[PDB]
Paper text:
Here we show that Psb29 in Synechocystis 6803, like THF1 in Arabidopsis, is important for normal accumulation of the FtsH heterocomplex involved in PSII repair. To gain further insights into Psb29, we have determined the crystal structure of Psb29 encoded by Thermosynechococcus elongatus, a thermophilic cyanobacterium widely used to study structural aspects of PSII assembly and repair. Each Psb29 subunit consists of 9 alpha helices. A search using PDBeFOLD found no known structures with greater than 70% similarity, indicating that the specific fold is novel.
Four crystal forms were obtained by hanging drop vapour diffusion; X-ray diffraction data were collected at resolutions from 3.6 Å to 1.4 Å and the structure of Psb29 determined by heavy atom SAD. If protease inhibitor was omitted, crystals were readily obtained in three crystal forms. Two of these were in P21 (designated A-P21 and B-P21) and the third in I222. The structure was solved by single-wavelength anomalous dispersion (SAD) with the A-P21 crystal form, soaked overnight with 1 mM dipotassium tetraiodomercurate (Jena Bioscience). Heavy atom sites for A-P21 were found and the structure phased using the autoSHARP pipeline. The initial model was built with Buccaneer and refined with REFMAC. Psb29 in the other crystal forms was proteolytically cleaved at the C-terminus. In the B-P21 crystal form, the new carboxy terminus at residue Ala189 is clearly visible in the electron density. It is likely that proteolytic cleavage of the C-terminal helix allows more compact higher resolution crystal lattices to form, as there is insufficient space in these lattices to accommodate the C-terminal helix observed in the P6322 crystal form.
Numbering used by the authors: 4 to 189
The structure:
């Protein structure tokens, strides 16, 4: 039964190389965030969570040098959170099968009640995190037809179909996109 302090300690003990100030707050924030999730007893890991973490990390770590340490940092962060970085990476990778598929097909699979894995992750209940929203956003970007042009319209199509809390998703992705647009234009 670990603590935020214990987690920060495990991360810094595993990765004793310098981390630049530009990147260090994002990493600390993500350490705390995942910690708080993973000790909620209703949180249940799934590939949607994996895709979210990989996506958010990859986005804020763009440009990081020395680039070789990006993987050491990912490893240290996973082990600090009592996760297996190989499992998170496999799970993220498992979504690649849907590249180029149309939204109609995905909705058909979800409405059948027997969606393939990891798409079935969208049904599974448990404590919701903004990282689930990030994961969902990464998955939708893979589909044919630029479905995130009108992201909220796409999310309204999913609302009757999946128990993921779509109003929370819509707001989390508005904040995610706002934050990234600011960071990118500074
Ligand atoms: Hg990780």
């Amino acid at each position: 039964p670990r603590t935020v302090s214990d987690t920060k300690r495990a991360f810094y003990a595993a990765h004793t190389r310098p981390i630049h100030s530009i990147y260090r707050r994002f990493i600390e924030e993500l350490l705390v965030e995942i910690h708080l999730l993973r000790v909620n007893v209703d949180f249940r890991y799934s590939p949607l969570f994996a895709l979210g973490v990989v996506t958010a990390f990859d986005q804020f770590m763009e440009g990081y040098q020395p680039e070789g340490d990006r993987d050491r940092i990912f490893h240290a962060l996973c082990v600090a959170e009592e996760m297996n970085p190989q499992q998170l990476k496999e799970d993220a990778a498992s979504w690649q099968q849907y590249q180029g598929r149309p939204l109609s097909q995905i909705l058909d699979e979800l409405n059948s009640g027997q969606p393939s894995a990891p798409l079935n992750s969208l049904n599974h209940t448990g404590k919701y995190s903004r990282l689930h929203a990030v994961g969902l956003y990464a998955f939708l970007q893979e589909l044919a037809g630029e479905v995130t042009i009108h992201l909220n319209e796409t999310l309204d199509q999913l609302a009757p179909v999946i128990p993921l809390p779509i109003e929370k998703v819509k707001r989390d992705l508005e904040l995610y996109r706002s934050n990234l647009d600011k960071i990118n234009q500074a």
